């Protein structure tokens, strides 16, 4: 059987999962226009597309998550629905705030 495929597979299941290019990278070991080249290419055929769910990621109080966890203003939400939001109990939600430089308790 192919091997290069197979790890095609496991670079592709990470972007699908959630990853970005940036990680995919490293993960597969490639370069920006290796893996980018094969999302592009995945994509067209569907095996990274259609596919939601819950996953577990190794990025917190990242931008992306900056940009999530201020939803708590527009919805109105509270530091115990926060919580639930970005996967945290509560002590990761603190370092939002505090490396932020707001206002917390």
């Given at each position: 059987?192919?091997?290069?495929?197979?790890?095609?597979?496991?670079?592709?299941?990470?972007?699908?999962?959630?990853?970005?290019?940036?990680?995919?990278?490293?993960?597969?070991?490639?370069?920006?226009?290796?893996?980018?080249?094969?999302?592009?290419?995945?994509?067209?055929?569907?095996?990274?597309?259609?596919?939601?769910?819950?996953?577990?990621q190794h990025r917190r109080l990242t931008?992306?998550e900056?940009?999530?966890?201020?939803?708590?203003?527009?919805?109105?939400?509270?530091?115990?629905?926060?919580?639930?939001?970005l996967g945290r109990?509560?002590?990761t939600?603190?370092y939002a705030?505090?490396?932020?430089?707001?206002?917390?308790?």
């Amino acid at each position: 059987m192919p091997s290069v495929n197979d790890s095609l597979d496991i670079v592709e299941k990470l972007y699908k999962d959630g990853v970005p290019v940036k990680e995919i990278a490293k993960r597969s070991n490639n370069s920006m226009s290796t893996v980018y080249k094969a999302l592009e290419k995945l994509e067209a055929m569907g095996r990274i597309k259609r596919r939601k769910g819950r996953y577990r990621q190794h990025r917190r109080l990242t931008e992306e998550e900056l940009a999530t966890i201020r939803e708590l203003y527009l919805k109105g939400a509270t530091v115990y629905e926060i919580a639930r939001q970005l996967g945290r109990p509560e002590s990761t939600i603190y370092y939002a705030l505090k490396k932020l430089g707001l206002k917390l308790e």
